[PDB]
Design a protein around this nucleic acid. Structure first.
Ligand SMILES: Nc1ncnc2c1ncn2[C@@H]1O[C@H](COP(=O)(O)OP(=O)(O)OP(=O)(O)O)[C@@H](O)[C@H]1O
Ligand SMILES: Nc1nc2c(ncn2[C@@H]2O[C@H](COP(=O)(O)OP(=O)(O)O)[C@@H](O)[C@H]2O)c(=O)[nH]1
Ligand SMILES: [Mg+2]
Ligand SMILES: [Mg+2]
Ligand SMILES: [Mg+2]
Ligand SMILES: [Mg+2]
Ligand SMILES: [Mg+2]
Ligand SMILES: [Mg+2]
Ligand SMILES: [Mg+2]
Ligand SMILES: [Mg+2]
Lengths: 101, 353, 73, 208
RNA sequence: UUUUCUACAUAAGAAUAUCCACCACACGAAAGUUUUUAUGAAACUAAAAACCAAAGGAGGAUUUAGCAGUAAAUCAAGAA
């Protein structure tokens, strides 16, 4: 069990994106180039939009891996701001100290 | 104890031992010799002092010596003045200008060529050539200044050509050139074309023995650099598009006889040039330096210790330095250090101490 | 910068023939004028000036070449 | 304040050090200045040992500054002294024999004298008593009077000048006006005296 | 007006709410219309240009901040 239903949805979304990552890249190349005929580009737009909705990189949401907080998450540690302080204040993170200057 | 104004005023007999000496020039003399733009810092100084004085500089003496040996049979000789900002390059040119006026020479003096390049309110397309522009406001002002510079030559010169202004008025051959410039002043639309006609007529007739032609152009680097002025599309125009620059460009290429041109490359009015750059090559660029060889690059320097004392003593004679302690040697040392014995910086300091 | 087939070279030819015509000297040849020692001094000065760049001595060398080429002292 | 209580204000006047042998008490003062090993603050950027500076000019220059443009404020103060000098020089030329040796051509003398005529002699401070405010005159200190004169100069030439007329020339005109005791600043000084004299019976309210 | 524009680091040129026989004009659109670019499956989001030039002419009772490299002015990067 993931910590929340929202976290489970993200795992399905990331998994679907990985499967269709290469196929989307090949089709999206045709659209983003102006040297191909406009007739072919219109057909490509139909095919790229016919792919499943969840297979979109923009729909991927970055959460915390511990508490699944949708925002306030540092990208480096992939942790929420509350959990990061909880680990750092106890000295359980290497090289992290209270800033004084 | 310094000698400031004891030297007798004569541009012809100025010798080397008279270095760092001020010679008086009459106020009415400035009116008939400098109708164009005198430098604003110097023009303000003479108005307050009510006395016009100029110090004999080494570059002025060096250029004076070459002028006395000029051979009018030989083609034109190009002299250029270069140096750092505030060294009195314009006043050195004005010293040459007064000398040639005293010898009754034909004067073509340009106060600042940058004015004809930047900040033009009116941009009228030309008629002689469709792909060229006109600057009536700048051209008309120069003609009025040139008209008052000399009057004897404006009537002595006879125009031998066929010139048509419009379908209603025209000027035929035999008319004095003074009537042509007066037509250009009254008719501002064709004033720019009048400037080209005046320039080309003098150049063609300069080969005769009736002329002692001197052309003074200040800011020659503006004849080849890029121009700020744009067009209806707000696109920059080349410096060759302007008719005034294009015709004046023909006045510096060494092909005519019986004349000499004194040039000066400056930085104060330059466009797209850095503050520190003062040497002739970078100011002119590749194209500017290419169409100017050969020349004599006379260098203008700062004050020497002898000159510095003379300038300070000159102000004390006019009671300009009004500070209580400015009369002591300690004040003189501070002026030397702060101004770096540079004439331009010294004038700014003395204006408020 | 190469001296051969240059715009500065064209100016020198025009500058020298005018003096020769003014002095009424009927000798006119490309080899004669371009083989002069003074022109060789001019060639060295211009090439050095455009390549090395502006300098106090470089301009001083340029002054000497022009003064001797124009018979001005 | 990065300076501790031990640090003191440096002495800049060079003449104070070059001729100490003509006095005894002052010699004891500065010989103990370093014998006590008292630390000295760094020299401020504005003040300098140049003989051409003046303390009243620096204070006036600082107040003219808006934001952080010391260059612009110094530039304006340079032109104003020049502008005053130009006007006095022109007036000297167009004068008779007796009028010639009357006009002052020293802007520093004019500037110092102008401010000494714009300083009020007695100010006003509100005092609350009985639920109402009474304007009670007080003998303003010398520093306040000197500062108040400078503020009036700046306030006048910033507000009621025209948009076309430049700042350096407008301030130059008022300095000459104050030098002759006829400027609007002098009028404002008299107006403060009018109110102080009117409330001359309320001076008993103040308790110092 | 200690202002605006351009060149450029700070010594320059030019403009400047007014005159008018007609004109046309200063400061100030960040807004809005149109076009284009960037991201993205999707532009409704952001940015650039052209056109456009409105309120605003130092703000009522009252009120906030700062003791020195501080206030204020100006520039830059980073987090997501
Ligand atoms: N020969 C001189 N005699 C007296 N005063 C001089 C002389 N030369 C220069 N000055 C003073 O120095 C000022 C600078 O002169 P000028 O404007 O000619 O300088 P410039 O070097 O040509 O400047 P820029 O860099 O603007 O081209 C003059 O206004 C004058 O006050
Ligand atoms: N209005 C007018 N101007 C003329 C006429 N002829 C010559 N000019 C002017 O004289 C100047 C010299 O032109 P020019 O150098 O001979 O032209 P180019 O041969 O193309 O370089 C030009 O700027 C013209 O404006 C004419 O018939 N009418
Ligand atoms: Mg839960
Ligand atoms: Mg798209
Ligand atoms: Mg997202
Ligand atoms: Mg100059
Ligand atoms: Mg300016
Ligand atoms: Mg505007
Ligand atoms: Mg605007
Ligand atoms: Mg907008």
């Amino acid at each position: 069990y993931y910590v929340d239903w929202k976290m489970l949805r993200d795992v399905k979304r990331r998994k679907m994106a990985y499967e269709y990552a290469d196929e989307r890249l090949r089709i999206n190349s045709l659209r983003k180039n102006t040297i191909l005929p406009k007739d072919l580009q219109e057909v490509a737009d139909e095919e790229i939009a016919s792919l499943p909705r969840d297979s979109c990189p923009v729909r991927i949401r970055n959460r915390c891996v511990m508490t699944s907080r949708p925002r306030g998450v540092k990208r480096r540690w992939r942790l929420s701001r509350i959990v990061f302080r909880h680990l750092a204040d106890h000295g359980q993170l290497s090289g992290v100290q209270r800033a004084m200057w | 104890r310094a000698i400031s104004r004891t030297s007798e005023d004569d541009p012809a007999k100025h010798r080397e031992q008279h270095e760092g000496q001020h010679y008086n020039i009459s106020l009415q003399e400035l009116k008939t010799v400098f109708p164009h733009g005198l430098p604003p810092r110097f023009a303000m100084q003479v108005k307050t002092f009510n006395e016009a004085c100029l110090m004999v500089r080494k570059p002025a003496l060096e250029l004076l010596h070459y002028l006395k040996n000029t051979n009018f049979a030989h083609p034109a000789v190009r002299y250029v003045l270069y140096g750092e900002k505030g060294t009195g390059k314009t006043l050195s040119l004005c010293h040459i200008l007064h000398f040639c006026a005293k010898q009754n020479w034909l004067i073509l003096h340009i106060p600042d060529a940058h004015i004809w390049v930047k900040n033009c309110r009116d941009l009228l397309q030309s008629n002689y050539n469709k792909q060229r522009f006109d600057q009536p406001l700048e051209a008309s002002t120069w003609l009025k200044n040139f008209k008052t510079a000399n009057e004897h030559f404006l009537s002595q010169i006879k125009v031998q050509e066929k010139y048509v202004w419009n379908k209603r008025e025209s000027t035929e051959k035999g008319r004095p050139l003074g009537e042509v410039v007066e037509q250009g002043i009254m008719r501002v639309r064709n004033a720019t074309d009048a400037v080209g006609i005046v320039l080309k007529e003098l150049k063609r007739q300069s080969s005769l023995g009736i002329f002692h032609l001197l052309v003074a152009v200040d800011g020659v680097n503006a004849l080849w650099g890029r121009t700020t002025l744009k067009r209806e599309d707000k696109s920059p125009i080349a410096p060759e598009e302007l008719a005034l620059i294009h015709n004046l460009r023909k006045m510096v290429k060494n092909d005519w006889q019986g004349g000499a041109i004194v040039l000066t490359v400056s930085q104060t009015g330059s466009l797209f040039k850095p503050r520190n750059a003062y040497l002739p090559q970078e100011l002119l660029g590749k194209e500017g330096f290419d169409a100017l060889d050969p020349f004599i690059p006379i260098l203008v320097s700062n004050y020497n210790p002898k000159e510095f004392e003379s300038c300070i003593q000159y102000y004390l004679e006019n009671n300009w330095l009004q500070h209580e302690k400015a009369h002591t040697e300690e004040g003189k040392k501070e002026l030397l250090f702060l101004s770096n014995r540079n004439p331009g910086q010294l004038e700014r300091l003395c204006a408020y101490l | 910068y190469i001296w051969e087939n240059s715009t500065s070279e064209k100016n020198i030819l025009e500058t020298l023939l005018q003096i020769k015509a003014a002095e009424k000297n009927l000798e006119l040849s490309k080899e004669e004028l371009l083989g002069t020692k003074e022109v060789e001094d001019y060639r060295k000065s211009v090439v050095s000036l455009k390549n090395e760049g502006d300098n106090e001595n470089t301009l001083s060398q340029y002054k000497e070449s022009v003064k001797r080429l124009l018979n001005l002292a | 304040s990065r300076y501790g209580p031990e640090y003191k204000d440096p002495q800049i006047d060079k003449e104070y050090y070059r001729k100490p042998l003509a006095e005894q008490t002052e010699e004891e003062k500065y010989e103990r200045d370093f014998k006590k090993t008292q630390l000295i603050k760094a020299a401020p950027a504005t003040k300098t040992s140049s003989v051409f500076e003046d303390p009243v000019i620096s204070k006036f220059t600082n107040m003219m500054m808006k934001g952080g443009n010391k260059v612009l404020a110094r530039s304006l103060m340079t032109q104003t002294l020049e502008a005053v000098k130009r006007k006095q020089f022109a007036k000297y030329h167009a004068a008779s024999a007796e009028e010639q040796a009357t006009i002052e051509r020293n802007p520093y003398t004019i500037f110092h004298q102008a401010l000494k005529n714009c300083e009020p002699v007695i100010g006003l401070v509100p005092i609350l008593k009985g639920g109402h405010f009474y304007q009670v005159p007080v003998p303003l200190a010398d520093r306040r009077r000197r500062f108040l004169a400078m503020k009036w100069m700046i306030a006048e030439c910033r507000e009621k000048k025209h948009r076309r007329v430049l700042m350096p020339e407008k301030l130059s005109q008022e300095l000459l006006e104050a030098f002759h005791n006829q400027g609007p600043v002098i009028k404002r000084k008299h107006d403060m005296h009018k109110m102080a004299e009117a409330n001359r019976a309320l001076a008993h309210y103040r308790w110092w």
